[PDB]
Amino acid sequence: ATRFRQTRRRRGHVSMGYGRIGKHRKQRGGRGNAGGQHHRKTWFTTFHPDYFGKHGMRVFHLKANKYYCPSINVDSLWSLVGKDVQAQYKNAKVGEEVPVIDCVKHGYFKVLGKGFLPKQPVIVRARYFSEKAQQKIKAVGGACELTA
Amino acid sequence: AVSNIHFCKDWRSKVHTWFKQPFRKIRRHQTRVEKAKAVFPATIKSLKPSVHCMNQRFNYKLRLGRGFTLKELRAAKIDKNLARTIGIAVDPRRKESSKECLNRNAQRLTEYMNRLVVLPKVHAATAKRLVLNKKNAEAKTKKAAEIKKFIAEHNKTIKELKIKVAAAKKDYAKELKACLKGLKKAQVAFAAQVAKKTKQFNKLPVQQKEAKQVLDANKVIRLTAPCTLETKTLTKGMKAFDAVAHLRKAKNVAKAVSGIVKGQKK
Amino acid sequence: MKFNCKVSSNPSKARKALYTANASQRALMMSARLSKELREKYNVIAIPIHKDDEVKIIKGHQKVAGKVTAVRRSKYVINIDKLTKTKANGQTVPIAIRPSNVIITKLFLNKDREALLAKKAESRKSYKELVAKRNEEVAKAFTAVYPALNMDIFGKKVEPITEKKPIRIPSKKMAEKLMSKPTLRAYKTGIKVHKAKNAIAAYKAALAKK
RNA sequence: AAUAAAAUAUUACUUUGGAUAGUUUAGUUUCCUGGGCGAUGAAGAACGCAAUGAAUUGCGAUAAGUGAUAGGAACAAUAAAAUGUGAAUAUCCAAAAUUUGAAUGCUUGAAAGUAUACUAAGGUAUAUAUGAUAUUCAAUAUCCA
RNA sequence: AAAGAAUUUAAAACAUAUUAGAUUUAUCUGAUGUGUGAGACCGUAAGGUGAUUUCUAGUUAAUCCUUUAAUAAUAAGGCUU
RNA sequence: AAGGUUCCUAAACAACAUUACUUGGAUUAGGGUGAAUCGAUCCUAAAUUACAGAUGGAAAUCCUUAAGAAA
RNA sequence: AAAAUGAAGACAUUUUAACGAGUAAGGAAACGAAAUGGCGUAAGGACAACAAAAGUAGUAAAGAUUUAAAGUAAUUUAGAU
RNA sequence: AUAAACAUACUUUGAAUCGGCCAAGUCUGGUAAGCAGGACUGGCGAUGCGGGAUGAACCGAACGUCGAGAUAAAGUGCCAAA
RNA sequence: CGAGAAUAGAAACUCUUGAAGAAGUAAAUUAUCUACCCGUCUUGAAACACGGACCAAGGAGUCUAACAUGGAUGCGAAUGAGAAUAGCAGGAAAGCUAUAACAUGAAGAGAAAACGAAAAACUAUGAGAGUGUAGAAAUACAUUUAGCAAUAGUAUCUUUCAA
RNA sequence: AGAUUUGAGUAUCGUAAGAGGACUCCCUUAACUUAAGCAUAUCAAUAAGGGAAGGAAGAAAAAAUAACAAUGAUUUCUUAAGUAAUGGCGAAUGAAAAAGAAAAAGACCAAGUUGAUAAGAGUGUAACUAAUAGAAAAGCUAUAUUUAAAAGGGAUAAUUUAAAUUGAAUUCAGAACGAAUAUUGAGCCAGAGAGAGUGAAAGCCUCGUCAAUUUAGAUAUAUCUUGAAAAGAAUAUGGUUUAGAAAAGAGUAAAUUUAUUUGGAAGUAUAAAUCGAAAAGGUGAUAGUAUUCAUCAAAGUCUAAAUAUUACAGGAAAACUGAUAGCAAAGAAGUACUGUGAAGGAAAACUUAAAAGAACUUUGGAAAAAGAGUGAAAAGAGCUUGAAAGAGUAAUAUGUGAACGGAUAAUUUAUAAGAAAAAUAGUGGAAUAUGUUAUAAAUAAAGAUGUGAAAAGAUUAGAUAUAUAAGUAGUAUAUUUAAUAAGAUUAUGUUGAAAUUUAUAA
Fold it and tell me: Which of A107, B121, B207, C129 stands 20 to 30 A from C38 (CA)?
């Protein structure tokens, strides 16, 4: 909407809101990130203080698929099957059927341990596990399974 | 925020605008319809394998590939010279990746051949194949009389056990320990008895039927059956199994091969 | 609406094709209507005009009836021996008339107007039998759903539904709060004006009764 | 002190000028279909042709048009003649298509010309490179009587 | 010393043996064969056995990270000063 | 050489020749350029440009009788 | 700014109190007690005589010249030609 | 003690600007400058109004449109109110 | 003599001018007071600083792309999927529908290998809710209770040589 | 002399050239600009110069990715992604596998084999030839399996392209106008109310538009005929007696150096100089050697479809411009005009419905003027309207070295405010107020909780018919047979808010 711009409100003002002493000229210190070390050094120091330099080792061809590992905490495990199933198997223990949570089938590879699990036995199947993830699953009365 | 905008070249000559998009749909759709009218089983989008995706990021998913390998055609009893003429993709470049891939795509072809209805090469009722089917029809009646005696006397000890499992599971859903053990014990015995020669090629299903025209065979034969909620019985072994040390032992085994080789030469 | 994608609904392109049309398409454009006596004899509505025909002007200052003396297709006009104007110095010049302001009252039919009129007549009949076959098909479907009615109801008067069943909806309280000021003020004024009109009508009725 | 000739100010009318309003046989953009030239001489250029034409349009020594097929009574600024035994008008058709132009017998400046062969005048062929076939030759280049 | 079933039928690479042909060279070409490479544990008797993992005690080896199929000794790159 | 009808005649003076013009190299309409012997055409000067050949990634350049079964 | 009232009146409510200069610069739209208020140009979608002929127009449109009126102002309205 | 609830504490986003100039019971260099450079405050710039005849800065005092009065700087022979 | 209070008392008018033009307003002229050339750079211009003879029409913060803040909107551990693309009626550059690749987010630290979050928290001040008394109009105190947001400080946990 | 090799002349039949180059494939080492200077870098496969193409072109069937539960020619779109990387590590530059779609198609030469070898080649035509990847020829054969006499003709149908034809409903009535489409009244059509013309605004005046018809042109689209339905042939795995006891792209891959290029960094691609392989080998992007692993098999060729387009031609649209705007060009516009030349390059729209474009008289040398006449109106051709600047005429007013503006009054002119009516005392109450009833209308429910039905389907177990099938309930389709699980959608009980406020008639 060009009728809501400031140009329509500054009609009649000579300088169009840019100043009489310091005019609106072509440039204001260079094109792009010019003067990163000379006159805009106070800008880069203030707002991007690690912009110039080198850090870490180069990876000539990075295989970004090798780092792909979606994670889910323990407290979020039961949301994969829903609350209806969670309450249905609420009073299970060793010996009878217990629901299996297929983390991989839902797109989660690693299971981390954060928050608190509901006090029901459960079988967790995933590719990777954390030390506290397995502790919390086992302390509730469940098991851990590997995949792939 | 430091800006990174690559407009320092003549982007005005690099601008591609999509004003032809609403007419690509009309072009492609009309040509797609024109193909169906000309010869319908050409736009049929000939049958394709079920092949896994690559890399560990995708490897649990299935997707259509290009062409059935020559070993999958032999297992499904189809000549590769006839496969391309009845809407089957064939890819000799595909190496067999696993037995399970060989079995899964063998089921796909067999299921496709059952749903397939090949019309006679010549529409006349005096076609040689139609005449030949009449000539050997009485032989088929004799032969099919033996195909039914078999697979009615050999798969009978497991059928009752298989029936009992369904009834016992139905009763449980209203035991399974001994019900499933009996079927398992028979299955190993059955697998021990098969260890003998089957026809190289099956027959092409050729007949005269009213043409029900289907635009693709890939959406009829689904890649993956719908996933339900798998449920398992908790045992003491499942509780005991400590998965973290299995992960860390497996990692440390692979990272100690350097130490093994270094210590050998010393 | 027009559904043929070949033809254009652009006024500028329509006028250009009118100015640049050749003589073949100019003849079929300068058509005039036959009179009642000629229409009944030939069963033809209108035909392209021709020299030596007799026409009758129906629109204009002078509704004279004369003979076609000039069919000028470049100007898209015709001339009549009876409509002339004296050009000051004394000689008379014909007055141009558009062919859509006259009707033909006496044909000039040598040999091919006769063939055209027969072709024009049969086309009228052939279309009529086709419309009849459609209307019967339309009527056959109406008597299958309403066996007690006949198709003549559509040509007669229509009686509106006078039943006034109201509906309770929990938004009518919000109606006044869902209008903008320009449409709320107009809506309220219409209510006030309507009420005052009823007040005057009520007062008039009281006087009339008394 | 006085004058209103000049000067100034307002309105009405007229004038020089062409703003404003109304309008569009013109453009701009996007999309669909094609993307159909030439040694069988193209695109381009030049000259000529209307009863009265200078430009423009169309055309080529058959000239603002011929034949054929559709087409049905006009054109017009002014005369003429032709015209239902067929005027206008239309065309992926038929005949015809001047001098040049890749320009191609040789020459070409604003150049007028001109050689040979075949069928006086007219019309055809003859540039360079190149494939196949036919024919005539050259070199002891390899053998060889 | 303490817990520990491990998931379930369509198969090819060839390490080879043993033969049917051809070859002399730095010799090859078919087929038959076992293992390899295989994984359904024995239970209606409580469940034992048993791969694989844990803790403690000596031993020999490697030990800051990377060169993205796995290692090695050179080389190169990372991290801190 | 350059110009291109400005040449001759007749009718006519709106515009143009720093007034005017019955005048005009200006407007309109006609008429006008005759070669065996004058020139072009023919020959060659300074110079110029082709086929083949040589050179160049290319466009193209060099060579003018040297390189050619050419001329 | 604070109190009161508040589905529609209307003048963007009622009352009381304090305040109002200004270059550069800022205060986009919407927001019932309205987080500034408005004028104008052109085009697009709606609305415009509520009872079935529904804004104006050859009983004179747009435009132009002026005379007056409304508005602090941008501007609007009407008469005459 | 006095003042302070349209007080206080702010947070976010951003404009313009960093050529300055004057006064003085002030200072430094200079013979001196309507010169050059500083400390504190007030002004002009950005500012009209009343007075100094006139004036960017001096004195009074800062501005919505008006009426009536008491005033400020400063004045009361005429221009000019007294 | 006399406040409070109780009891009784009293205000509705004249003149002049105006469709023979009142009040107001406007235009022209006159008279007193008053008024330097606009725009711009500049500490400072009416400036002997520059542009401007006059009039009409044209005339200058726009469009595409990335990020951020902010006000209105939908949904919310999800949001978008007018990603391509595939279908529907209608004939449609419009409209409707597609359990979907992916984008941003739900997990963070490390150069990297290798990893990957609770003492079901604590303390302080703080929003709100009642009861009683009184002034007495509103309101002002006493007391019981809850302690969200925000800020600050604590334990505890993931990663890093180092928080 | 004769047999060959090689090179020419001539003749015949053809072939290339030039135009265009928007999109396509390439050659070449531009600079302005950015980096607040500048020299590498950026601009930048960008401008200009040059070559070659078609309706599309380029590419295309792995010496390819990856390290997986692995894929699988090419092309194009989405995402990856402003990411890995490159860079005075500054300014800046910058991909690809995976994954999701559009479309899908694979075939040949060379080498090897067969040699009573075949008008042109014997220095070799022809035939066979690959993932079970030691092939290749002749004759027998077993098993599965494919199989109508091909191609070309003729006809009908269907899908399309173009042309032609057809294509409703007021030639209605009144009033008025120079003129009807407007206005008033009464009707009609509509699968047609897109649009244009008509003295002026039209659904029904003309042309068209919606629904259609006919005729021609193709499709590798089906049917029937020619055409017999036979003989045979073909695919693959074996056996058998002979014949044979192979091949797989060389100045190429790679290497040293130089130059350009690349995101490619101890060298990603190309080229040049030198060097130069093979009883093979290439790749796995950090140089080197070795041992394993994985995956391909270069150094010859072709190949539709999905894709691009601002040349040009034909169409259709538009929240685009409306004569200083939009192309430079709304008229004989790349025109007039300028330059030796390359080149440069404008301006100019409108009378009226219809020319009915005054036509005769007087004055004047004539142009013209005054009458006269046409037209609804001179709108009179310098022609719709006709502004401002600048003038002329008329009316009004003013005056000593500027003019204009503002506050305040005076004079003159203009505008402009009205028809009702007093006091007191007989009748006469008239809208309205108060409260009494009657009526009408409006105004209270957000939810919560019970009981059913139900389409299209899903699963399981049988039956029938068809096709194909010997190994853990055969499989697939069509019709039913019963049963279980849920079901979008959907019907109906209980529960739970009134008594006020306006208007109307007494």
Answer: C129
Q: Specify the experimental method.
A: cryo-EM
DSSP B14-42: T----TTHHHHHHHHHHHHHHHHHH-TTT
Sort out which chain B residues have CB atoms less than 8 A from A99's CB and list them. Answer: 229-232
- Confirm or reject contact between B3 and chain A (CB < 8 A): yes
What count of other Cβ atoms lies within 10 Å of the Cβ of residue B64?
Answer: 13
Specify whether the CB–CB gap between B87 and B44 falls below 8 A.
yes
CA-CA distance, B224 to A106, in Å (whole number)? 15
Question: Which residues lie across from B68 on neighbouring strands?
Answer: B90
Element (H, E) at B232: strand B231-233
Q: Which of A95, A76, A96, A78 is nearest to A87 (CA)?
A: A78
> How many CA atoms, within 13 angstroms, populate the side-chain half-sphere of residue A63?
5
> Which residue in this structure is represented by tokens 């092409």?
B204
Residues paired with residue C46 on neighbouring β-strands, in sequence order: C33
Q: Which segments within A39-127 are labelled E, that is strand?
A: 71-72, 97-102, 110-111, 123-125
Indicate the SS3 state at residue A50.
coil
- Angstroms from B98 CA to nearest CA on chain A: 15
CB C96 within 8 A of CB C78: yes
Q: Pick the residue of A43, A94, A96, A127 with the most B CBs within 10 A to test the interface with B by mutation.
A: A94
With 0-12 / 13-18 / 19 or more C-beta atoms within 10 angstroms meaning exposed / middle / buried, residue A111 is buried
As ranges, strand G nucleotides with an atom below 7 A of a protein CB are: 7-9, 23-29, 36, 38, 40, 47, 50-52
Chain E: positions less than 7 Å from a protein CB are: 3-6, 8-13, 40, 42-44, 51-54, 60-63, 65-66, 68, 70-73, 77-79
The two counts, helices (H) then strands (E), for chain B are 12, 3
The answer to whether residues A126 and A108 touch, using CB atoms and an 8 Å cutoff, is yes
DSSP letter, residue C59? S
